[PDB]
Design a protein around this ligand. Structure first.
Ligand SMILES: CC(=O)N[C@@H]1[C@@H](O)[C@H](O[C@@H]2O[C@H](CO)[C@H](O)[C@H](O)[C@H]2O[C@@H]2O[C@@H](C)[C@@H](O)[C@@H](O)[C@@H]2O)[C@@H](CO)O[C@H]1O
Ligand SMILES: CC(=O)N[C@@H]1[C@@H](O)[C@H](O[C@@H]2O[C@H](CO)[C@H](O)[C@H](O)[C@H]2O[C@@H]2O[C@@H](C)[C@@H](O)[C@@H](O)[C@@H]2O)[C@@H](CO)O[C@H]1O
Lengths: 280, 289
């Protein structure tokens, strides 16, 4: 039978930035469509987009410096073959990235870190296997690192982390709010954004759970309960869809942002696509 | 009982935020370690400072304080809640790379950020380093204030010519002080050697751990009854399905093999999957690998 991880929300990682989840929310416009490329996995365990398996692959970049830019590789150094980008590549669109890297095969001295400042303008072509950067340091060779922070693409612009990059690209498809009155649940993390939290649609440990289990889909949606692990009380009903995202019906004026963050999702039963949830 | 059905190279280190790139045995196979992260019993009991998620590994959170002699952090758990000094050496996820300077990249939580949002906190493991009592001191070229959350970025020598040995752990107390350490892991005899999972990480002048992080969360998640003295695992090539070697997973939460003379698991491919085979006696005799 399908299961979801027996891990409380506050011990689950974001699948789009290296951070822990600290709350759930729904979008202000509950019809908003998203197309995240990380955190994407079907219930049967099919990875989509650039989604990697481990939380320590999320939003990291590796490549060989050319001088300047990176000729991208997979995170293990093996060749990237022109998926939208290497697995784990960040998907925070329409902003500058600031990526902290080190030289992998190097006897290191001094300060080993370089910060790569990356713009999402014309030379940003990760699908083709390269990006450009500027840096106040002097990185060379095989650089591996992690998205550290983001900032506006142009002066006065705002960063919207609900957007994805233009990779060129075999994108994971958009997610449309399904059914009637349902709102997609977004799992939020603090992250340093110059000029708001970063949303994702599955906690990272849910992605690896589905990859490991390869459970067959036996209905149109899976009803989950979000349970207090001490009193065992059901705190809310949620629907987990085969395409790999979760919805709720938010109480008017409220929603899952009002729930405690130490609850555990538990599979309850397979239900009909239009099963109508108790508002939360 | 199961272990993660995930290839080794897709598993995270439990002591630094990095992926595992190989296994090895220690050069002295009688060496005892006492890592505080990556520690969890097979029944799912976390030990030491070990957290559940790979994105909690080697992170620090606290509130900045200033005195006449400099700045520091009054530590919290990574979610900002009170630190459990009564039962742990430090907040869960706190780094356990001993006897070196740490360089930790942090940002101010709940701050409308402008300019460069990052601070690098340079931390020495000298006298004011008493994380168990709830504070550490740092120097920084930036001006961090308030609630800072961040991740160990790199490590360097404590003194000029010293050498960073990432097999060591910190001294968490200020004195005789009880710090609630996870106990040492002893090679269990009869030629068995502890298996160490290694990652690249920036060390000025690889980092081992004893469980991949996803094994820890797997054990916490299942709360599986331990039904024998050890669990026999096979390390299986996922493309050819061939058994590449036998390993033993002990209830206290570590893995051994018997390494071939001159060799060992460092000579195995790094994309295999561990698979539970059977519960066995603590003295189940392994074929060398
Ligand atoms: C008040 C003012 O003029 N501030 C300027 C900063 O906004 C500039 O930062 C840069 O801002 C652009 C957007 O217009 C873009 O976000 C750049 O990535 C960003 O530069 C980053 O942040 C800077 C503070 C530096 O740390 C730089 O190395 C980073 O790459 C800066 C830089 O142009 O000028 C200020 O005057
Ligand atoms: C002597 C040499 O070849 N290089 C020196 C660096 O090793 C020094 O860095 C500092 O080294 C001490 C060890 O005695 C300790 O590891 C400090 O943490 C380390 O400082 C870090 O690295 C420095 C290079 C700076 O980037 C500093 O901001 C970091 O915090 C430096 C110290 O200025 O002197 C070099 O000559």
């Amino acid at each position: 039978q399908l299961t979801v991880p027996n891990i409380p929300l506050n011990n689950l990682a974001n699948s789009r930035v290296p951070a822990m989840i600290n709350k759930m929310t729904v979008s202000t416009d509950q019809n908003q469509v998203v197309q995240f490329q990380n955190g994407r996995c079907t219930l049967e365990g099919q990875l989509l987009g650039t989604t990697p398996v481990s939380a320590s692959q999320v939003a990291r970049i590796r490549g060989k410096v050319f001088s300047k830019g990176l000729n991208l590789t997979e995170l293990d150094g093996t060749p990237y073959h022109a998926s939208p980008a290497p697995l784990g590549f960040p998907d925070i669109g329409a902003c500058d990235w600031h990526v902290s890297t080190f030289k992998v095969d190097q006897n290191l001295s001094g300060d080993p870190m370089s910060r790569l400042d990356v713009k999402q303008n014309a030379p940003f072509a990760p699908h083709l296997g390269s990006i450009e950067f500027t840096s106040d340091q002097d990185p060379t060779g095989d650089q591996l690192g992690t998205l550290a922070w983001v900032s506006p693409s142009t002066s006065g612009a705002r960063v919207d982390p609900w957007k994805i990059p233009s990779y060129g690209t075999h994108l994971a498809p958009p997610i449309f709010p399904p059914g009637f009155g349902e709102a997609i649940v977004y799992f939020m993390s603090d992250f340093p954004i110059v000029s708001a939290q970063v949303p994702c649609t599955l906690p990272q440990e849910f992605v690896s759970h589905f990859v490991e289990q390869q459970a067959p889909v036996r209905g149109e949606a899976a009803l989950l309960h979000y349970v207090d692990p001490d009193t065992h009380r059901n705190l809310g009903e949620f629907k987990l869809y085969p395409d790999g995202f979760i919805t709720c019906v938010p109480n008017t004026g409220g929603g899952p942002q009002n729930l405690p963050t130490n609850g555990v999702f538990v599979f309850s039963s397979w239900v009909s696509r239009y099963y109508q949830l108790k508002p939360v």
